[PDB]
Amino acid sequence: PRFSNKTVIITGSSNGIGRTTAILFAQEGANVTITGRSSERLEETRQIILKSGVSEKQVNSVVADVTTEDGQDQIINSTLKQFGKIDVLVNNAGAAIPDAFGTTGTDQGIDIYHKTLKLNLQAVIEMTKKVKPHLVASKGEIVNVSSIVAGPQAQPDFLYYAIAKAALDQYTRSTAIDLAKFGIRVNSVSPGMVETGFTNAMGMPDQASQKFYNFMASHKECIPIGAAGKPEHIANIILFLADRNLSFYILGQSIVADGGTSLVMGTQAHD
Amino acid sequence: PRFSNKTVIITGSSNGIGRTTAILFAQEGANVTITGRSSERLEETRQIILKSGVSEKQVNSVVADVTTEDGQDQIINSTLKQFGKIDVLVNNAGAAIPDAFGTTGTDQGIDIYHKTLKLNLQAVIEMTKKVKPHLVASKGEIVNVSSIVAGPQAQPDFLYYAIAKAALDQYTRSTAIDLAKFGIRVNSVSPGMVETGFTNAMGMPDQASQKFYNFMASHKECIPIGAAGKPEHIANIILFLADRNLSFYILGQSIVADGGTSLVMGTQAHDV
Amino acid sequence: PRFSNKTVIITGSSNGIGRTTAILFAQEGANVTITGRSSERLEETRQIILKSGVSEKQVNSVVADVTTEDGQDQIINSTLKQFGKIDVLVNNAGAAIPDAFGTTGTDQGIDIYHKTLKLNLQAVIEMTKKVKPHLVASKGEIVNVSSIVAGPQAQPDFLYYAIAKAALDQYTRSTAIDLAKFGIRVNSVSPGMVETGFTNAMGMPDQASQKFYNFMASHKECIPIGAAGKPEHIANIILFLADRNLSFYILGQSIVADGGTSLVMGTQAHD
Amino acid sequence: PRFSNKTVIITGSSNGIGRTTAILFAQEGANVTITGRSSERLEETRQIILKSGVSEKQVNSVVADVTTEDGQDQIINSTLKQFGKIDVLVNNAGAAIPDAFGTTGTDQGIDIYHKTLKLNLQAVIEMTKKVKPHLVASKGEIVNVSSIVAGPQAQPDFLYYAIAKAALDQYTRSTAIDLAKFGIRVNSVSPGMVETGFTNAMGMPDQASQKFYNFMASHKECIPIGAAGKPEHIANIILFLADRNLSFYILGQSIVADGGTSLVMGTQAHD
Ligand SMILES: NC(=O)C1=CN([C@@H]2O[C@H](COP(=O)(O)OP(=O)(O)OC[C@H]3O[C@@H](n4cnc5c(N)ncnc54)[C@H](OP(=O)(O)O)[C@@H]3O)[C@@H](O)[C@H]2O)C=CC1
Ligand SMILES: NC(=O)C1=CN([C@@H]2O[C@H](COP(=O)(O)OP(=O)(O)OC[C@H]3O[C@@H](n4cnc5c(N)ncnc54)[C@H](OP(=O)(O)O)[C@@H]3O)[C@@H](O)[C@H]2O)C=CC1
Ligand SMILES: NC(=O)C1=CN([C@@H]2O[C@H](COP(=O)(O)OP(=O)(O)OC[C@H]3O[C@@H](n4cnc5c(N)ncnc54)[C@H](OP(=O)(O)O)[C@@H]3O)[C@@H](O)[C@H]2O)C=CC1
Ligand SMILES: NC(=O)C1=CN([C@@H]2O[C@H](COP(=O)(O)OP(=O)(O)OC[C@H]3O[C@@H](n4cnc5c(N)ncnc54)[C@H](OP(=O)(O)O)[C@@H]3O)[C@@H](O)[C@H]2O)C=CC1
């Protein structure tokens, strides 16, 4: 009942963090617009929600590319058409786009740059501007999903993904102050490693990804808390930030949720 | 129900943030140890909890000075003797101790340096060390209360209070990493302006304080969100951080809750 | 001459910080490539250098748009053609591109987003990629010019300029670590208000600009040090970071030089 | 002669960074006050100064505990007595005080806390307040020496040394803004690993320290620059910060000089 009568758009909800976030919002009694590119996985999210006893009248699934004008327009229009308003936008869609040759570092082509920023930054900007007037009317909120790769530590392998998130953080802070005069609250969450479809999207096989998780989780210099992040761990923070009654006074912040990963220095990997 | 069968110590719970935090914890089913020096205000906190349907056996009221070895031991020891364990420690007690001659800035006397750090930093460190063995056994948690005055912006008026909170943020981060090996979770919250007994404690008349709150709340360059912070605003965050089930993956962080105050540059108080 | 036998590329040297930086480098025995779009102002810079005791053979002038592939290529290649190498690159060109209709905040159009990042971010990335093999050979350095607008405080007016600089800082940190293995040192400077052609490029009249400078310099909550920044103030820091013998151990850092501006909170403008 | 006719007090100049800093200031024609507890090593610095060609009339040696009202009074008294004024104060003295049983982590005793802050924080505060009236007259400067251990990364072993430095950074920022009204410039430098007497002071055998330096320098995740810091590396920065003509616009900042150490994440130590 936390979000009863609230319409929430969750980008990237056809998998990972976005999927679980939409599921929680739904269970919380909210109208949810779930979206992604893979029709099969998007429906899977829809099914998880229906099996919850939640009506399909409270769910709007949209197959679209969030980096295209038409895709963005479809997400916004279908939500208003089915719900008549927008209370919260969660810019969750994102990915570390790899090169065709697994190239990392300064050598990554400018094409990777363009593709990564278009998704991890530009889309966030366009969705924000398009939902803006609707949030002004509903005195709504925005919750962006960033990453500790934004900084303050260097990220020398997937540099464009890193700088796009760094730009995201200042975009979150800046629109938060700008939109605050209209009663809107903009915040963010910067996850550390979380088990989702992220690594698979990068080209990592399921078995290699599992090996990645176990190593990270079992070494304290990697993840101090000793456990791999799970989708719910981030979804919980997103809902908290969207619950004005609870997180009200937090504004323009991106909460780091990384089990302590960003607090450990490279030298500390050695005794 | 969120904190049923959980024992929480809330330092500085005889007023402001600590009072409301203690109240919310009790309403959430927790055994709570409330403490402070003013016996009159501490009892007020207790009454509010009792007149909520909370049994007196779920409350441990302790009058003590958290800056002394004896006061610290009493807080922890009475909690163990009353509830049998400690699940959460919220280091909330703190204050911007004023200069006896009203001096601010670099000129503030060294005596104020000692009193300020002993309260806003040393007490937190000693309570952490003293509750540690019990939190190891319960795989509990710690939530400290810092302030945006810790940085990154400069604080030229009450410098000792500021550096004390700056030191505290690194203590939070460092004990979070050191204690994580025991299944413990240390986090913090850094509030902006919140209406409590803080300004009064500083010697400000309630009339001046109200004018301060109203002015800060009405000027977007001061508090962007447009409203003064309330004790509950910070209490909700502390409970959230104490709720391992919900906030689990957040570790060694001090969430800024200031309505945007710290995001505003001085130059931005003026229009182009 | 502490920069003798050193060849330096100074982007955006037809005006402001870049012009002064080029002057000082040349003044200290360096081969310098100056570049910009306004040939008249670019020639202005060359004459100042020449007016000294510097021979025209130590100065290479390139009229080019640093945002285009061709412009970027002309700058690098003419530098290699005339001097035979590249020891340090200073990514100074940058500008807060205004909306033709004066819009600010979240409302600024996507066209401004594209133009702002293309110059303040993309150009830096491409110049870096393009000079890399030569910096690897000379074990040279890179000095980027950022801005305090990058963060940690919000910038609700010229958001895109702000986020491009925030991304720039993480690009500086990340390339510093990636390129450190090659003996290269990447650093940066984040200026506060500086009297240059910056406000003019934005469209501000000279009278308004001087009025802006005076107000900032005379109000401690704006500029604590009590004086407007000057081109030379930023140039001195660039040279210091480019001077490996002196600043060697500084790596992946962007020194803030703002007379204390970023250290003052909005509330402190009252007290 | 960059600092000719300028009087500089360099605390902790009987070894490491302070020694080298005092030496450079002296070579630059500055009146210097070198202080420490070990008269032997203190005189060693003095000797290095005189052998540089500097007259001992511009050298004031002082043996004193910088943590006592007396020691600091003596440092300041002899400085004014022999020089009549004070232009710059460098708060360099500091150290990581070990537990009687090598105890580390949260368990370090309160005794360690007291000793650590008294030297690393309190002394800086006291020297700052005591030189203040003299810097106001001379529109002088202050340069403190902090450490990357102050944050943003956690320091779980010597917690007290870390929080004292973190407090130092906010003290630097705050006194800089406060003292700026008098034309005084306060800044700082935050070193990464530098080969000095630091480790020995901790109780580490010289052979072990060498093993430590070699290991740190040879591991990219430890020191990306590939070389251990040298006292000269930090001294260079201190003098830069003291040279108002050059570093003028930098105010209330602590320049990180760690060869990139603080930029590497714990996970990045693994492939
Ligand atoms: N996993 C981790 O460790 C971390 C993740 N993050 C952030 O989490 C988000 C990614 O989610 P998880 O984290 O859940 O990742 P996956 O689980 O990788 O989820 C990717 C999600 O975004 C969508 N998406 C990607 N590209 C597009 C596109 N062009 N158009 C529409 N939708 C798109 C996917 O749609 P579908 O596949 O159909 O396309 C899917 O729902 C990003 O913002 C990422 O940076 C931050 C830090 C760490
Ligand atoms: N109010 C604001 O705008 C902000 C407050 N904060 C933080 O909030 C905390 C203060 O609470 P509010 O903020 O609620 O302040 P008051 O409402 O000022 O609460 C002070 C609390 O701490 C206790 N306390 C102070 N000194 C001691 C001492 N020596 N021994 C034991 N208890 C002591 C008080 O006990 P009783 O009076 O008996 O002594 C009381 O419960 C501090 O940690 C402060 O830095 C951070 C940022 C902003
Ligand atoms: N002035 C201030 O207060 C601050 C400035 N900065 C940074 O300083 C830099 C700007 O210099 P000042 O600061 O000296 O500014 P101006 O003095 O504004 O200098 C702009 C410089 O960059 C060049 N430039 C702009 N766009 C292009 C382009 N498409 N192709 C080639 N050159 C281009 C100009 O060339 P010409 O005009 O021919 O085109 C000129 O040399 C930026 O990186 C800016 O963000 C950061 C903070 C504050
Ligand atoms: N070495 C490293 O890797 C790093 C060092 N630092 C900082 O450098 C400083 C220490 O110098 P180095 O770094 O050169 O260390 P040593 O080379 O360890 O120098 C210690 C210096 O400070 C003095 N000192 C220490 N305690 C006292 C005291 N109670 N009274 C008077 N003087 C005292 C010493 O005097 P003498 O022994 O007579 O007493 C000596 O000149 C500290 O500020 C430290 O935090 C920061 C980061 C890294």
PDB file of N, CA, C and O in Angstrom, chain D residues 118-143:
ATOM      1  N   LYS D 118      46.937  14.404  18.938  1.00  0.00           N
ATOM      2  CA  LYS D 118      47.685  15.496  19.556  1.00  0.00           C
ATOM      3  C   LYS D 118      48.786  15.998  18.617  1.00  0.00           C
ATOM      4  O   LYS D 118      49.010  17.206  18.481  1.00  0.00           O
ATOM      5  N   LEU D 119      49.465  15.058  17.967  1.00  0.00           N
ATOM      6  CA  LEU D 119      50.529  15.385  17.028  1.00  0.00           C
ATOM      7  C   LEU D 119      49.995  15.743  15.643  1.00  0.00           C
ATOM      8  O   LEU D 119      50.245  16.832  15.132  1.00  0.00           O
ATOM      9  N   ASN D 120      49.254  14.815  15.044  1.00  0.00           N
ATOM     10  CA  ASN D 120      48.724  15.001  13.697  1.00  0.00           C
ATOM     11  C   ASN D 120      47.608  16.025  13.504  1.00  0.00           C
ATOM     12  O   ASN D 120      47.383  16.487  12.384  1.00  0.00           O
ATOM     13  N   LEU D 121      46.906  16.394  14.571  1.00  0.00           N
ATOM     14  CA  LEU D 121      45.836  17.378  14.421  1.00  0.00           C
ATOM     15  C   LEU D 121      45.996  18.579  15.352  1.00  0.00           C
ATOM     16  O   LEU D 121      46.101  19.721  14.897  1.00  0.00           O
ATOM     17  N   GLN D 122      46.023  18.313  16.653  1.00  0.00           N
ATOM     18  CA  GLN D 122      46.141  19.370  17.652  1.00  0.00           C
ATOM     19  C   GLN D 122      47.316  20.315  17.447  1.00  0.00           C
ATOM     20  O   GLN D 122      47.151  21.530  17.523  1.00  0.00           O
ATOM     21  N   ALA D 123      48.495  19.759  17.187  1.00  0.00           N
ATOM     22  CA  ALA D 123      49.691  20.567  16.976  1.00  0.00           C
ATOM     23  C   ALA D 123      49.504  21.507  15.797  1.00  0.00           C
ATOM     24  O   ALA D 123      49.896  22.675  15.854  1.00  0.00           O
ATOM     25  N   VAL D 124      48.917  20.991  14.719  1.00  0.00           N
ATOM     26  CA  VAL D 124      48.684  21.804  13.534  1.00  0.00           C
ATOM     27  C   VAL D 124      47.771  22.969  13.896  1.00  0.00           C
ATOM     28  O   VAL D 124      47.996  24.103  13.477  1.00  0.00           O
ATOM     29  N   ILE D 125      46.736  22.679  14.674  1.00  0.00           N
ATOM     30  CA  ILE D 125      45.780  23.696  15.091  1.00  0.00           C
ATOM     31  C   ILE D 125      46.454  24.768  15.940  1.00  0.00           C
ATOM     32  O   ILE D 125      46.248  25.963  15.719  1.00  0.00           O
ATOM     33  N   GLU D 126      47.275  24.333  16.892  1.00  0.00           N
ATOM     34  CA  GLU D 126      47.977  25.247  17.791  1.00  0.00           C
ATOM     35  C   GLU D 126      49.018  26.110  17.082  1.00  0.00           C
ATOM     36  O   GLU D 126      49.127  27.309  17.348  1.00  0.00           O
ATOM     37  N   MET D 127      49.785  25.505  16.182  1.00  0.00           N
ATOM     38  CA  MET D 127      50.787  26.255  15.438  1.00  0.00           C
ATOM     39  C   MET D 127      50.090  27.257  14.526  1.00  0.00           C
ATOM     40  O   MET D 127      50.556  28.386  14.353  1.00  0.00           O
ATOM     41  N   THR D 128      48.962  26.847  13.951  1.00  0.00           N
ATOM     42  CA  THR D 128      48.205  27.732  13.072  1.00  0.00           C
ATOM     43  C   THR D 128      47.730  28.957  13.859  1.00  0.00           C
ATOM     44  O   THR D 128      47.937  30.092  13.441  1.00  0.00           O
ATOM     45  N   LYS D 129      47.103  28.723  15.006  1.00  0.00           N
ATOM     46  CA  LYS D 129      46.599  29.820  15.830  1.00  0.00           C
ATOM     47  C   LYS D 129      47.712  30.736  16.348  1.00  0.00           C
ATOM     48  O   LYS D 129      47.543  31.956  16.418  1.00  0.00           O
ATOM     49  N   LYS D 130      48.850  30.147  16.698  1.00  0.00           N
ATOM     50  CA  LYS D 130      49.975  30.912  17.221  1.00  0.00           C
ATOM     51  C   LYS D 130      50.753  31.711  16.178  1.00  0.00           C
ATOM     52  O   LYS D 130      51.329  32.747  16.498  1.00  0.00           O
ATOM     53  N   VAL D 131      50.767  31.256  14.930  1.00  0.00           N
ATOM     54  CA  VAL D 131      51.468  32.008  13.891  1.00  0.00           C
ATOM     55  C   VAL D 131      50.520  33.017  13.238  1.00  0.00           C
ATOM     56  O   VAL D 131      50.950  34.032  12.685  1.00  0.00           O
ATOM     57  N   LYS D 132      49.224  32.737  13.332  1.00  0.00           N
ATOM     58  CA  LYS D 132      48.187  33.574  12.738  1.00  0.00           C
ATOM     59  C   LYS D 132      48.427  35.078  12.785  1.00  0.00           C
ATOM     60  O   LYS D 132      48.457  35.735  11.743  1.00  0.00           O
ATOM     61  N   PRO D 133      48.600  35.651  13.988  1.00  0.00           N
ATOM     62  CA  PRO D 133      48.827  37.099  14.061  1.00  0.00           C
ATOM     63  C   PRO D 133      50.026  37.580  13.247  1.00  0.00           C
ATOM     64  O   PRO D 133      50.050  38.716  12.780  1.00  0.00           O
ATOM     65  N   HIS D 134      51.011  36.709  13.070  1.00  0.00           N
ATOM     66  CA  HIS D 134      52.210  37.063  12.314  1.00  0.00           C
ATOM     67  C   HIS D 134      52.009  36.929  10.813  1.00  0.00           C
ATOM     68  O   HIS D 134      52.655  37.628  10.029  1.00  0.00           O
ATOM     69  N   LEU D 135      51.121  36.023  10.415  1.00  0.00           N
ATOM     70  CA  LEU D 135      50.839  35.819   9.005  1.00  0.00           C
ATOM     71  C   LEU D 135      49.872  36.898   8.540  1.00  0.00           C
ATOM     72  O   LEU D 135      49.854  37.257   7.365  1.00  0.00           O
ATOM     73  N   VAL D 136      49.064  37.404   9.470  1.00  0.00           N
ATOM     74  CA  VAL D 136      48.115  38.460   9.150  1.00  0.00           C
ATOM     75  C   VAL D 136      48.934  39.701   8.807  1.00  0.00           C
ATOM     76  O   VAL D 136      48.646  40.403   7.837  1.00  0.00           O
ATOM     77  N   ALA D 137      49.970  39.952   9.598  1.00  0.00           N
ATOM     78  CA  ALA D 137      50.832  41.110   9.377  1.00  0.00           C
ATOM     79  C   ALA D 137      51.572  40.996   8.048  1.00  0.00           C
ATOM     80  O   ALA D 137      51.665  41.963   7.290  1.00  0.00           O
ATOM     81  N   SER D 138      52.089  39.803   7.768  1.00  0.00           N
ATOM     82  CA  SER D 138      52.841  39.566   6.543  1.00  0.00           C
ATOM     83  C   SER D 138      52.008  39.030   5.379  1.00  0.00           C
ATOM     84  O   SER D 138      52.542  38.820   4.293  1.00  0.00           O
ATOM     85  N   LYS D 139      50.708  38.830   5.591  1.00  0.00           N
ATOM     86  CA  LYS D 139      49.850  38.266   4.551  1.00  0.00           C
ATOM     87  C   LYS D 139      50.577  37.003   4.102  1.00  0.00           C
ATOM     88  O   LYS D 139      50.844  36.793   2.919  1.00  0.00           O
ATOM     89  N   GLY D 140      50.904  36.174   5.085  1.00  0.00           N
ATOM     90  CA  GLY D 140      51.637  34.952   4.828  1.00  0.00           C
ATOM     91  C   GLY D 140      50.858  33.774   4.291  1.00  0.00           C
ATOM     92  O   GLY D 140      49.767  33.920   3.731  1.00  0.00           O
ATOM     93  N   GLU D 141      51.430  32.591   4.478  1.00  0.00           N
ATOM     94  CA  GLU D 141      50.821  31.371   3.980  1.00  0.00           C
ATOM     95  C   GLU D 141      51.035  30.167   4.885  1.00  0.00           C
ATOM     96  O   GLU D 141      51.937  30.143   5.728  1.00  0.00           O
ATOM     97  N   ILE D 142      50.194  29.161   4.689  1.00  0.00           N
ATOM     98  CA  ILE D 142      50.277  27.930   5.448  1.00  0.00           C
ATOM     99  C   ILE D 142      50.118  26.742   4.505  1.00  0.00           C
ATOM    100  O   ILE D 142      49.248  26.731   3.635  1.00  0.00           O
ATOM    101  N   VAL D 143      50.970  25.745   4.678  1.00  0.00           N
ATOM    102  CA  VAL D 143      50.884  24.545   3.877  1.00  0.00           C
ATOM    103  C   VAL D 143      50.958  23.379   4.846  1.00  0.00           C
ATOM    104  O   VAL D 143      51.940  23.220   5.572  1.00  0.00           O
TER     105      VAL D 143
END
